[PDB]
Protein backbone atom coordinates (compact mmCIF):
# COMPACT_ATOMS: atom_id res chain seq x y z
CA UNK A 1 0.00 0.00 0.00
CA UNK A 2 2.91 2.33 0.77
CA UNK A 3 3.95 1.90 -2.88
CA UNK A 4 1.05 4.21 -3.79
CA UNK A 5 2.59 7.00 -1.68
CA UNK A 6 5.61 7.93 -3.82
CA UNK A 7 6.37 10.56 -6.43
CA UNK A 8 5.25 10.30 -10.04
CA UNK A 9 5.53 12.27 -13.27
CA UNK A 10 2.61 13.95 -15.06
CA UNK A 11 3.29 15.72 -18.35
CA UNK A 12 0.58 18.25 -17.48
CA UNK A 13 -1.55 19.12 -14.48
CA UNK A 14 -4.73 17.05 -14.28
CA UNK A 15 -7.71 18.90 -12.75
CA UNK A 16 -9.52 16.55 -10.41
CA UNK A 17 -6.42 14.41 -9.85
CA UNK A 18 -5.20 14.22 -6.25
CA UNK A 19 -2.42 11.72 -5.60
CA UNK A 20 -3.52 11.58 -1.96
CA UNK A 21 -7.18 10.80 -2.70
CA UNK A 22 -6.41 8.28 -5.46
CA UNK A 23 -3.79 6.37 -3.45
CA UNK A 24 -6.21 5.94 -0.52
CA UNK A 25 -9.22 4.95 -2.63
CA UNK A 26 -11.24 8.07 -1.82
CA UNK A 27 -11.37 8.62 -5.59
CA UNK A 28 -13.14 5.55 -7.04
CA UNK A 29 -12.04 6.23 -10.63
CA UNK A 30 -10.34 3.15 -12.05
CA UNK A 31 -8.80 5.30 -14.80
CA UNK A 32 -7.29 7.69 -12.25
CA UNK A 33 -5.84 4.72 -10.35
CA UNK A 34 -4.28 3.65 -13.65
CA UNK A 35 -2.89 7.16 -14.10
CA UNK A 36 -1.44 7.16 -10.57
CA UNK A 37 0.27 3.79 -10.98
CA UNK A 38 1.51 4.66 -14.47
CA UNK A 39 3.01 8.00 -13.41
CA UNK A 40 4.83 6.36 -10.49
CA UNK A 41 6.07 3.50 -12.67
CA UNK A 42 7.27 5.96 -15.32
CA UNK A 43 9.36 7.86 -12.77
CA UNK A 44 10.93 4.73 -11.27
CA UNK A 45 11.61 3.33 -14.75
CA UNK A 46 13.86 6.27 -15.66
CA UNK A 47 16.32 4.83 -13.14
CA UNK A 48 15.46 1.12 -13.24
CA UNK A 49 15.55 0.82 -17.05
CA UNK A 50 19.33 1.31 -16.99
CA UNK A 51 19.98 -1.91 -15.03
CA UNK A 52 19.77 -5.43 -16.46
CA UNK A 53 18.73 -7.15 -13.24
CA UNK A 54 19.26 -10.62 -14.74
CA UNK A 55 22.98 -9.76 -14.44
CA UNK A 56 22.68 -8.31 -10.91
CA UNK A 57 22.80 -10.22 -7.63
CA UNK A 58 22.47 -7.77 -4.72
CA UNK A 59 20.62 -4.48 -4.28
CA UNK A 60 21.01 -1.99 -1.41
CA UNK A 61 18.29 0.57 -0.65
CA UNK A 62 20.00 2.84 1.85
CA UNK A 63 16.76 4.53 2.94
CA UNK A 64 14.03 2.01 2.25
CA UNK A 65 11.05 3.38 4.21
CA UNK A 66 8.50 0.58 4.47
CA UNK A 67 10.56 -1.41 1.92
CA UNK A 68 7.98 -1.11 -0.87
CA UNK A 69 10.65 -0.63 -3.55
CA UNK A 70 12.83 -3.64 -2.73
CA UNK A 71 9.79 -5.86 -2.16
CA UNK A 72 8.50 -5.07 -5.65
CA UNK A 73 11.96 -5.68 -7.14
CA UNK A 74 12.23 -8.97 -5.25
CA UNK A 75 8.91 -10.22 -6.59
CA UNK A 76 9.79 -9.13 -10.14
CA UNK A 77 13.30 -10.68 -10.14
CA UNK A 78 13.15 -13.75 -7.89
CA UNK A 79 16.94 -14.26 -7.78
CA UNK A 80 17.77 -10.85 -6.29
CA UNK A 81 18.93 -10.26 -2.74
CA UNK A 82 17.72 -6.87 -1.51
CA UNK A 83 18.76 -5.12 1.70
CA UNK A 84 17.11 -1.98 3.06
CA UNK A 85 18.33 0.43 5.73
CA UNK A 86 16.04 2.54 7.88
CA UNK A 87 16.46 4.62 11.03
CA UNK A 88 13.04 3.66 12.43
CA UNK A 89 12.53 0.51 14.48
CA UNK A 90 8.85 0.98 13.62
CA UNK A 91 9.39 0.88 9.85
CA UNK A 92 11.99 -1.89 10.20
CA UNK A 93 9.65 -4.29 12.00
CA UNK A 94 6.67 -3.36 9.81
CA UNK A 95 8.76 -3.94 6.69
CA UNK A 96 9.84 -7.43 7.75
CA UNK A 97 6.16 -8.19 8.42
CA UNK A 98 5.29 -7.27 4.83
CA UNK A 99 8.28 -9.35 3.72
CA UNK A 100 7.11 -12.34 5.78
CA UNK A 101 3.57 -12.14 4.39
CA UNK A 102 4.94 -12.35 0.83
CA UNK A 103 7.35 -15.22 1.53
CA UNK A 104 10.37 -13.01 0.77
CA UNK A 105 12.26 -13.68 4.00
CA UNK A 106 15.03 -15.61 2.26
CA UNK A 107 16.07 -12.74 -0.01
CA UNK A 108 14.73 -9.38 1.23
CA UNK A 109 15.89 -7.82 4.50
CA UNK A 110 15.37 -4.53 6.33
CA UNK A 111 18.01 -3.46 8.86
CA UNK A 112 18.01 -0.58 11.34
CA UNK A 113 21.35 0.87 10.26
CA UNK A 114 22.50 4.46 9.77
CA UNK A 115 23.67 4.50 6.15
CA UNK A 116 25.80 7.58 6.84
CA UNK A 117 28.12 5.63 9.14
CA UNK A 118 27.01 1.97 9.33
CA UNK A 119 28.27 -0.48 6.73
CA UNK A 120 25.65 -2.61 4.95
CA UNK A 121 25.56 -6.42 4.83
CA UNK A 122 27.38 -7.02 1.52
CA UNK A 123 30.90 -5.95 0.60
CA UNK A 124 29.89 -5.00 -2.96
CA UNK A 125 26.36 -4.41 -4.20
CA UNK A 126 25.55 -4.47 -7.90
CA UNK A 127 22.90 -1.74 -7.49
CA UNK A 128 22.40 0.93 -4.83
CA UNK A 129 19.07 2.76 -4.67
CA UNK A 130 18.44 6.12 -3.04
CA UNK A 131 15.01 7.70 -3.59
CA UNK A 132 14.85 11.03 -1.71
CA UNK A 133 17.21 9.77 1.02
CA UNK A 134 20.38 11.85 0.64
CA UNK A 135 18.38 15.08 0.99
CA UNK A 136 17.50 14.05 4.57
CA UNK A 137 21.13 13.22 5.46
CA UNK A 138 23.41 16.14 6.25
CA UNK A 139 26.63 14.06 6.49
CA UNK A 140 26.61 13.46 2.74
CA UNK A 141 30.38 12.98 2.41
CA UNK A 142 30.39 10.24 5.04
CA UNK A 143 27.32 8.76 3.33
CA UNK A 144 28.82 8.64 -0.15
CA UNK A 145 32.04 7.16 1.19
CA UNK A 146 29.93 4.37 2.71
CA UNK A 147 27.88 3.87 -0.47
CA UNK A 148 30.79 3.91 -2.93
CA UNK A 149 33.02 1.64 -0.85
CA UNK A 150 30.23 -0.99 -0.88
CA UNK A 151 29.42 -0.64 -4.60
CA UNK A 152 30.86 -3.13 -7.06
CA UNK A 153 33.25 -1.69 -9.62
CA UNK A 154 31.06 -0.69 -12.55
CA UNK A 155 27.97 -1.09 -10.36
CA UNK A 156 25.02 1.28 -10.48
CA UNK A 157 24.02 4.00 -8.09
CA UNK A 158 20.47 5.16 -8.81
CA UNK A 159 19.49 8.37 -7.02
CA UNK A 160 16.32 10.47 -7.09
CA UNK A 161 17.03 13.68 -5.23
CA UNK A 162 16.82 17.46 -5.15
CA UNK A 163 19.22 20.13 -6.38
CA UNK A 164 19.12 23.61 -4.86
CA UNK A 165 19.12 26.44 -7.40
CA UNK A 166 14.23 19.49 7.53
CA UNK A 167 15.93 18.71 4.23
CA UNK A 168 19.57 19.47 3.44
CA UNK A 169 19.58 20.45 -0.23
CA UNK A 170 22.87 21.06 -2.03
CA UNK A 171 23.99 22.98 -5.10
CA UNK A 172 25.08 21.55 -8.47
CA UNK A 173 28.72 22.16 -7.49
CA UNK A 174 28.21 20.19 -4.28
CA UNK A 175 26.66 17.24 -6.12
CA UNK A 176 29.58 17.25 -8.57
CA UNK A 177 32.14 17.07 -5.76
CA UNK A 178 30.13 14.43 -3.87
CA UNK A 179 30.15 12.03 -6.81
CA UNK A 180 33.63 12.84 -8.12
CA UNK A 181 35.42 12.52 -4.77
CA UNK A 182 34.13 8.94 -4.38
CA UNK A 183 34.77 7.59 -7.87
CA UNK A 184 31.15 7.87 -9.01
CA UNK A 185 30.72 8.63 -12.72
CA UNK A 186 27.40 9.91 -14.04
CA UNK A 187 26.02 8.11 -17.07
CA UNK A 188 23.03 10.48 -17.17
CA UNK A 189 21.03 13.04 -15.22
CA UNK A 190 17.32 13.46 -15.97
CA UNK A 191 15.38 16.53 -14.81
CA UNK A 192 11.76 15.73 -13.88
CA UNK A 193 11.07 18.89 -11.87
CA UNK A 194 8.01 20.13 -13.76
CA UNK A 195 6.47 16.68 -14.25
CA UNK A 196 6.77 15.82 -10.54
CA UNK A 197 5.33 19.23 -9.66
CA UNK A 198 2.34 18.40 -11.87
CA UNK A 199 1.94 15.07 -10.05
CA UNK A 200 2.16 16.71 -6.62
CA UNK A 201 -0.22 19.58 -7.39
CA UNK A 202 -3.37 19.17 -5.29
CA UNK A 203 -5.23 22.45 -4.87
CA UNK A 204 -7.48 20.71 -2.31
CA UNK A 205 -4.51 19.17 -0.48
CA UNK A 206 -5.20 20.67 2.95
CA UNK A 207 -8.82 19.50 2.91
CA UNK A 208 -7.80 16.09 1.56
CA UNK A 209 -5.16 15.59 4.27
CA UNK A 210 -7.50 16.50 7.13
CA UNK A 211 -10.04 14.04 5.72
CA UNK A 212 -7.46 11.24 5.90
CA UNK A 213 -6.54 12.21 9.46
CA UNK A 214 -10.14 11.90 10.69
CA UNK A 215 -11.66 9.32 8.32
CA UNK A 216 -8.94 6.65 7.88
CA UNK A 217 -6.38 7.70 10.47
CA UNK A 218 -2.73 8.56 9.84
CA UNK A 219 0.49 8.12 11.79
CA UNK A 220 2.66 11.13 12.58
CA UNK A 221 5.38 9.76 10.29
CA UNK A 222 2.88 9.53 7.43
CA UNK A 223 1.42 13.01 7.93
CA UNK A 224 4.92 14.53 8.09
CA UNK A 225 5.88 12.81 4.83
CA UNK A 226 2.73 13.95 3.02
CA UNK A 227 3.13 17.59 4.06
CA UNK A 228 6.80 17.34 3.07
CA UNK A 229 5.81 16.05 -0.38
CA UNK A 230 3.39 18.94 -0.83
CA UNK A 231 6.02 21.51 0.16
CA UNK A 232 8.42 19.80 -2.26
CA UNK A 233 5.93 20.33 -5.07
CA UNK A 234 5.69 24.02 -4.21
CA UNK A 235 9.48 24.39 -4.20
CA UNK A 236 9.54 22.73 -7.63
CA UNK A 237 6.82 25.05 -8.96
CA UNK A 238 8.81 28.00 -7.62
CA UNK A 239 12.00 26.54 -9.19
CA UNK A 240 13.86 26.84 -5.88
CA UNK A 241 14.67 23.13 -6.24
CA UNK A 242 15.02 20.71 -9.11
CA UNK A 243 14.14 17.02 -8.84
CA UNK A 244 16.81 15.12 -10.76
CA UNK A 245 17.39 11.41 -11.33
CA UNK A 246 21.05 10.36 -11.18
CA UNK A 247 22.34 7.24 -12.92
CA UNK A 248 25.94 6.75 -11.80
CA UNK A 249 28.54 4.00 -11.90
CA UNK A 250 31.49 3.25 -9.66
CA UNK A 251 34.58 3.98 -11.77
CA UNK A 252 38.05 3.80 -10.21
CA UNK A 253 39.95 3.98 -13.51
CA UNK A 254 38.83 7.33 -14.96
CA UNK A 255 41.11 10.27 -14.19
CA UNK A 256 39.78 12.47 -11.39
CA UNK A 257 39.91 15.65 -13.46
CA UNK A 258 37.97 13.97 -16.27
CA UNK A 259 35.51 12.58 -13.72
CA UNK A 260 34.74 16.11 -12.53
CA UNK A 261 34.32 17.24 -16.15
CA UNK A 262 31.77 14.61 -17.09
CA UNK A 263 29.85 14.84 -13.79
CA UNK A 264 29.67 18.62 -14.20
CA UNK A 265 28.24 18.21 -17.72
CA UNK A 266 25.34 16.07 -16.50
CA UNK A 267 24.67 17.96 -13.26
CA UNK A 268 24.66 21.37 -14.96
CA UNK A 269 22.89 20.10 -18.12
CA UNK A 270 20.54 17.23 -17.26
CA UNK A 271 18.42 15.67 -19.96
CA UNK A 272 14.84 17.00 -19.86
CA UNK A 273 12.32 14.26 -19.19
CA UNK A 274 9.91 15.41 -21.92
CA UNK A 275 12.50 14.80 -24.68
CA UNK A 276 13.31 11.16 -23.85
CA UNK A 277 11.90 7.94 -25.28
CA UNK A 278 13.80 4.67 -24.80
CA UNK A 279 11.24 2.00 -25.79
CA UNK B 280 57.90 12.07 -32.80
CA UNK B 281 55.64 11.64 -35.84
CA UNK B 282 51.88 11.06 -35.91
CA UNK B 283 49.86 9.78 -38.88
CA UNK B 284 46.73 11.69 -37.84
CA UNK B 285 45.39 15.20 -38.22
CA UNK B 286 45.47 17.80 -35.46
CA UNK B 287 43.13 20.36 -33.96
CA UNK B 288 43.49 24.11 -34.46
CA UNK B 289 41.15 26.34 -32.48
CA UNK B 290 40.94 28.74 -35.44
CA UNK B 291 42.28 29.08 -38.96
CA UNK B 292 46.01 29.81 -38.96
CA UNK B 293 46.89 31.74 -42.14
CA UNK B 294 50.28 30.82 -43.53
CA UNK B 295 50.08 27.43 -41.81
CA UNK B 296 49.93 24.66 -44.40
CA UNK B 297 49.91 21.14 -42.97
CA UNK B 298 51.20 20.01 -46.36
CA UNK B 299 54.11 22.47 -46.39
CA UNK B 300 55.05 21.82 -42.76
CA UNK B 301 54.63 18.05 -42.55
CA UNK B 302 56.28 17.38 -45.94
CA UNK B 303 59.23 19.75 -45.86
CA UNK B 304 58.48 22.92 -47.79
CA UNK B 305 58.33 25.13 -44.68
CA UNK B 306 61.43 25.38 -42.42
CA UNK B 307 59.68 27.32 -39.63
CA UNK B 308 60.19 25.64 -36.27
CA UNK B 309 57.24 27.49 -34.72
CA UNK B 310 54.89 26.08 -37.36
CA UNK B 311 56.41 22.62 -36.88
CA UNK B 312 55.73 22.99 -33.17
CA UNK B 313 52.18 24.10 -33.97
CA UNK B 314 51.69 20.98 -36.11
CA UNK B 315 52.89 18.64 -33.37
CA UNK B 316 50.99 20.46 -30.62
CA UNK B 317 47.77 20.31 -32.66
CA UNK B 318 48.26 16.55 -33.04
CA UNK B 319 49.02 16.02 -29.35
CA UNK B 320 45.97 18.05 -28.33
CA UNK B 321 43.71 15.85 -30.47
CA UNK B 322 44.77 12.58 -28.88
CA UNK B 323 45.10 14.14 -25.41
CA UNK B 324 41.33 14.69 -25.31
CA UNK B 325 41.06 10.89 -25.29
CA UNK B 326 44.14 10.01 -23.23
CA UNK B 327 43.41 12.49 -20.44
CA UNK B 328 40.29 10.51 -19.49
CA UNK B 329 42.31 7.43 -18.43
CA UNK B 330 44.18 7.05 -15.13
CA UNK B 331 47.13 5.17 -16.59
CA UNK B 332 48.65 4.67 -13.13
CA UNK B 333 45.75 2.22 -12.62
CA UNK B 334 46.13 0.51 -16.01
CA UNK B 335 48.53 -2.33 -16.78
CA UNK B 336 47.93 -3.10 -20.46
CA UNK B 337 47.29 -1.04 -23.60
CA UNK B 338 46.46 -2.17 -27.14
CA UNK B 339 46.94 0.18 -30.11
CA UNK B 340 45.27 -1.74 -32.93
CA UNK B 341 46.64 0.65 -35.58
CA UNK B 342 49.85 2.03 -34.14
CA UNK B 343 51.51 3.67 -37.15
CA UNK B 344 55.07 4.52 -36.13
CA UNK B 345 54.25 3.54 -32.51
CA UNK B 346 54.78 7.11 -31.28
CA UNK B 347 51.74 6.98 -28.99
CA UNK B 348 52.61 3.74 -27.20
CA UNK B 349 56.24 4.88 -27.01
CA UNK B 350 55.17 8.14 -25.36
CA UNK B 351 52.89 6.23 -22.98
CA UNK B 352 55.67 3.73 -22.27
CA UNK B 353 58.19 6.41 -21.36
CA UNK B 354 55.44 8.20 -19.40
CA UNK B 355 54.33 5.17 -17.35
CA UNK B 356 57.20 2.74 -16.76
CA UNK B 357 54.79 0.02 -15.58
CA UNK B 358 52.62 -0.19 -18.70
CA UNK B 359 52.80 -2.95 -21.26
CA UNK B 360 51.85 -1.69 -24.72
CA UNK B 361 51.19 -3.68 -27.89
CA UNK B 362 50.75 -2.16 -31.34
CA UNK B 363 49.36 -3.68 -34.52
CA UNK B 364 50.14 -2.39 -38.01
CA UNK B 365 49.79 -3.69 -41.55
CA UNK B 366 52.99 -1.91 -42.64
CA UNK B 367 56.33 -3.70 -42.46
CA UNK B 368 58.10 -0.35 -42.76
CA UNK B 369 56.18 1.25 -39.89
CA UNK B 370 56.76 -1.82 -37.71
CA UNK B 371 60.51 -1.94 -38.34
CA UNK B 372 60.83 1.81 -37.73
CA UNK B 373 58.77 1.63 -34.55
CA UNK B 374 60.69 -1.39 -33.27
CA UNK B 375 63.93 0.46 -34.02
CA UNK B 376 62.65 3.43 -32.01
CA UNK B 377 61.57 1.05 -29.24
CA UNK B 378 65.00 -0.59 -29.05
CA UNK B 379 66.78 2.78 -29.11
CA UNK B 380 64.68 3.74 -26.05
CA UNK B 381 65.32 0.48 -24.19
CA UNK B 382 61.58 -0.26 -24.27
CA UNK B 383 61.86 -3.66 -25.97
CA UNK B 384 60.51 -5.49 -22.93
CA UNK B 385 57.29 -3.57 -22.34
CA UNK B 386 56.50 -2.30 -25.85
CA UNK B 387 55.72 -4.67 -28.73
CA UNK B 388 54.82 -3.96 -32.36
CA UNK B 389 53.50 -6.73 -34.59
CA UNK B 390 52.38 -6.82 -38.22
CA UNK B 391 48.90 -8.23 -37.64
CA UNK B 392 45.36 -7.56 -38.87
CA UNK B 393 43.29 -6.25 -35.94
CA UNK B 394 40.02 -7.06 -37.76
CA UNK B 395 40.54 -10.81 -37.24
CA UNK B 396 43.85 -11.53 -35.49
CA UNK B 397 43.95 -11.82 -31.71
CA UNK B 398 46.33 -9.55 -29.75
CA UNK B 399 49.10 -10.73 -27.43
CA UNK B 400 47.09 -10.41 -24.19
CA UNK B 401 43.73 -11.92 -23.32
CA UNK B 402 42.41 -8.61 -21.96
CA UNK B 403 43.56 -5.00 -22.09
CA UNK B 404 42.78 -2.07 -19.81
CA UNK B 405 42.88 0.42 -22.70
CA UNK B 406 42.43 0.03 -26.46
CA UNK B 407 43.53 2.91 -28.71
CA UNK B 408 42.29 3.53 -32.23
CA UNK B 409 43.30 6.89 -33.71
CA UNK B 410 42.11 7.08 -37.34
CA UNK B 411 42.23 3.28 -37.70
CA UNK B 412 38.65 1.99 -37.83
CA UNK B 413 37.97 4.20 -40.86
CA UNK B 414 40.48 2.10 -42.84
CA UNK B 415 38.90 -1.27 -41.90
CA UNK B 416 35.92 -2.65 -43.81
CA UNK B 417 34.75 -5.60 -41.67
CA UNK B 418 34.03 -3.38 -38.70
CA UNK B 419 31.66 -5.84 -37.02
CA UNK B 420 34.53 -8.34 -37.06
CA UNK B 421 36.87 -5.60 -35.82
CA UNK B 422 34.69 -4.51 -32.91
CA UNK B 423 34.07 -8.12 -31.88
CA UNK B 424 37.84 -8.68 -31.73
CA UNK B 425 38.39 -5.42 -29.83
CA UNK B 426 35.52 -5.91 -27.37
CA UNK B 427 36.50 -9.54 -26.71
CA UNK B 428 39.94 -8.42 -25.48
CA UNK B 429 38.76 -5.42 -23.44
CA UNK B 430 38.53 -5.76 -19.67
CA UNK B 431 35.13 -5.10 -18.12
CA UNK B 432 35.08 -1.37 -17.45
CA UNK B 433 38.17 -0.95 -19.63
CA UNK B 434 38.49 1.94 -22.06
CA UNK B 435 38.26 2.14 -25.82
CA UNK B 436 39.55 5.44 -27.19
CA UNK B 437 38.72 6.13 -30.84
CA UNK B 438 39.34 9.03 -33.20
CA UNK B 439 37.24 8.40 -36.30
CA UNK B 440 34.77 9.86 -38.78
CA UNK B 441 30.97 9.93 -38.92
CA UNK B 442 29.35 10.04 -42.37
CA UNK B 443 26.41 12.45 -42.26
CA UNK B 444 38.62 4.74 -46.30
CA UNK B 445 35.18 3.45 -45.28
CA UNK B 446 32.98 5.90 -43.37
CA UNK B 447 30.08 4.95 -41.15
CA UNK B 448 26.71 6.55 -40.46
CA UNK B 449 25.50 7.64 -37.00
CA UNK B 450 23.16 4.63 -36.77
CA UNK B 451 25.97 2.26 -37.74
CA UNK B 452 28.17 3.64 -34.95
CA UNK B 453 25.39 3.20 -32.37
CA UNK B 454 24.87 -0.43 -33.39
CA UNK B 455 28.59 -1.25 -33.64
CA UNK B 456 29.15 0.05 -30.12
CA UNK B 457 25.95 -1.21 -28.50
CA UNK B 458 25.93 -4.73 -29.92
CA UNK B 459 29.47 -5.32 -28.60
CA UNK B 460 28.77 -3.99 -25.10
CA UNK B 461 30.58 -0.67 -25.51
CA UNK B 462 29.14 2.36 -23.72
CA UNK B 463 30.12 5.90 -24.65
CA UNK B 464 31.24 8.01 -21.71
CA UNK B 465 31.55 10.99 -24.04
CA UNK B 466 31.74 12.02 -27.68
CA UNK B 467 33.70 15.13 -28.64
CA UNK B 468 33.15 16.81 -32.01
CA UNK B 469 36.41 18.28 -33.35
CA UNK B 470 35.14 18.68 -36.92
CA UNK B 471 35.80 22.40 -37.35
CA UNK B 472 39.14 22.19 -35.52
CA UNK B 473 40.39 19.46 -37.85
CA UNK B 474 39.02 21.44 -40.79
CA UNK B 475 41.14 24.34 -39.52
CA UNK B 476 44.20 22.07 -39.34
CA UNK B 477 43.59 21.01 -42.95
CA UNK B 478 42.75 24.47 -44.32
CA UNK B 479 45.22 25.75 -46.90
CA UNK B 480 44.18 28.63 -49.15
CA UNK B 481 47.24 27.96 -51.35
CA UNK B 482 46.83 24.17 -51.39
CA UNK B 483 46.88 23.72 -55.16
CA UNK B 484 49.92 25.98 -55.55
CA UNK B 485 51.70 24.37 -52.58
CA UNK B 486 51.03 20.86 -53.89
CA UNK B 487 52.67 21.85 -57.19
CA UNK B 488 55.62 23.47 -55.42
CA UNK B 489 55.84 20.22 -53.45
CA UNK B 490 55.57 18.28 -56.71
CA UNK B 491 58.60 19.86 -58.40
CA UNK B 492 61.07 20.30 -55.52
CA UNK B 493 60.21 17.10 -53.58
CA UNK B 494 59.65 13.54 -54.74
CA UNK B 495 56.01 12.62 -54.12
CA UNK B 496 54.71 10.00 -56.61
CA UNK B 497 51.11 10.08 -57.80
CA UNK B 498 49.87 7.86 -54.94
CA UNK B 499 50.90 10.40 -52.30
CA UNK B 500 49.72 13.42 -54.31
CA UNK B 501 46.24 11.88 -54.56
CA UNK B 502 46.23 11.09 -50.83
CA UNK B 503 47.29 14.69 -50.17
CA UNK B 504 44.36 15.91 -52.29
CA UNK B 505 41.97 13.52 -50.52
CA UNK B 506 42.98 15.00 -47.16
CA UNK B 507 42.30 18.54 -48.35
CA UNK B 508 38.89 17.42 -49.63
CA UNK B 509 38.32 15.72 -46.28
CA UNK B 510 38.88 19.06 -44.56
CA UNK B 511 36.37 20.77 -46.84
CA UNK B 512 33.82 17.99 -46.27
CA UNK B 513 34.15 18.66 -42.54
CA UNK B 514 33.35 22.32 -43.23
CA UNK B 515 30.34 21.23 -45.29
CA UNK B 516 29.36 18.90 -42.41
CA UNK B 517 28.78 15.90 -44.67
CA UNK B 518 31.49 14.33 -42.49
CA UNK B 519 32.24 14.68 -38.79
CA UNK B 520 35.56 14.09 -37.03
CA UNK B 521 34.66 12.70 -33.63
CA UNK B 522 36.51 11.39 -30.55
CA UNK B 523 34.84 8.43 -28.83
CA UNK B 524 35.53 7.71 -25.16
CA UNK B 525 33.88 4.33 -24.61
CA UNK B 526 33.91 1.71 -21.86
CA UNK B 527 33.18 -2.00 -21.90
CA UNK B 528 29.86 -2.27 -20.03
CA UNK B 529 28.16 -5.67 -20.00
CA UNK B 530 25.70 -4.86 -17.19
CA UNK B 531 23.73 -1.95 -18.66
CA UNK B 532 20.38 -2.95 -20.13
CA UNK B 533 20.64 -3.17 -23.91
CA UNK B 534 17.76 -0.72 -24.41
CA UNK B 535 19.49 1.85 -22.21
CA UNK B 536 22.88 1.18 -23.81
CA UNK B 537 21.38 2.18 -27.16
CA UNK B 538 19.82 5.34 -25.68
CA UNK B 539 23.09 6.57 -24.15
CA UNK B 540 25.17 5.72 -27.21
CA UNK B 541 22.63 7.46 -29.45
CA UNK B 542 22.77 10.58 -27.26
CA UNK B 543 26.53 11.00 -27.60
CA UNK B 544 26.71 10.15 -31.31
CA UNK B 545 23.81 12.44 -32.23
CA UNK B 546 24.76 15.21 -29.76
CA UNK B 547 28.51 15.11 -29.13
CA UNK B 548 30.20 17.73 -27.00
CA UNK B 549 31.67 20.61 -29.05
CA UNK B 550 35.42 20.86 -28.54
CA UNK B 551 35.33 24.65 -28.10
CA UNK B 552 32.96 24.51 -25.09
CA UNK B 553 35.01 22.00 -23.06
CA UNK B 554 36.81 23.33 -19.98
Ligand SMILES: Nc1ncnc2c1ncn2[C@@H]1O[C@H](CSCC[C@H](N)C(=O)O)[C@@H](O)[C@H]1O
Nearest residue numbers: 063064065085086087088114115116131132
Ligand atom coordinates in the same frame (compact mmCIF):
# COMPACT_ATOMS: atom_id res chain seq x y z
N1 LIG C 1 20.84 8.20 7.53
C1 LIG C 1 19.93 7.28 7.23
N2 LIG C 1 20.26 5.94 7.27
C2 LIG C 1 19.33 4.98 6.95
N3 LIG C 1 18.05 5.36 6.60
C3 LIG C 1 17.72 6.67 6.55
C4 LIG C 1 18.65 7.65 6.86
N4 LIG C 1 18.04 8.86 6.73
C5 LIG C 1 16.75 8.66 6.35
N5 LIG C 1 16.55 7.31 6.23
C6 LIG C 1 15.32 6.61 5.85
O1 LIG C 1 14.75 7.09 4.65
C7 LIG C 1 13.35 6.88 4.70
C8 LIG C 1 12.57 8.12 4.24
S1 LIG C 1 13.31 9.06 2.88
C9 LIG C 1 13.24 7.67 1.72
C10 LIG C 1 11.87 7.03 1.52
C11 LIG C 1 11.88 5.93 0.47
N6 LIG C 1 12.73 6.32 -0.65
C12 LIG C 1 10.46 5.62 0.01
O2 LIG C 1 10.02 6.07 -1.05
O3 LIG C 1 9.72 4.90 0.68
C13 LIG C 1 12.99 6.54 6.14
O4 LIG C 1 12.64 5.19 6.22
C14 LIG C 1 14.26 6.75 6.92
O5 LIG C 1 14.42 5.78 7.93
Ligand SMILES: Nc1ncnc2c1ncn2[C@@H]1O[C@H](CSCC[C@H](N)C(=O)O)[C@@H](O)[C@H]1O
Nearest residue numbers: 282283284341342343363364365392393409
Ligand atom coordinates in the same frame (compact mmCIF):
# COMPACT_ATOMS: atom_id res chain seq x y z
N1 LIG D 1 43.19 -4.01 -40.34
C1 LIG D 1 44.22 -3.45 -39.70
N2 LIG D 1 44.88 -4.14 -38.72
C2 LIG D 1 45.94 -3.56 -38.05
N3 LIG D 1 46.34 -2.28 -38.37
C3 LIG D 1 45.69 -1.59 -39.34
C4 LIG D 1 44.62 -2.16 -40.02
N4 LIG D 1 44.17 -1.25 -40.93
C5 LIG D 1 44.94 -0.13 -40.83
N5 LIG D 1 45.88 -0.34 -39.85
C6 LIG D 1 46.92 0.60 -39.39
O1 LIG D 1 46.31 1.73 -38.80
C7 LIG D 1 47.11 2.87 -39.00
C8 LIG D 1 46.25 4.05 -39.44
S1 LIG D 1 47.19 5.60 -39.54
C9 LIG D 1 47.12 5.81 -37.73
C10 LIG D 1 48.50 5.66 -37.11
C11 LIG D 1 48.59 5.96 -35.62
N6 LIG D 1 47.35 5.60 -34.94
C12 LIG D 1 48.95 7.42 -35.39
O2 LIG D 1 48.31 8.11 -34.60
O3 LIG D 1 49.89 7.94 -35.99
C13 LIG D 1 48.17 2.51 -40.03
O4 LIG D 1 49.42 2.43 -39.38
C14 LIG D 1 47.79 1.13 -40.52
O5 LIG D 1 48.94 0.33 -40.69
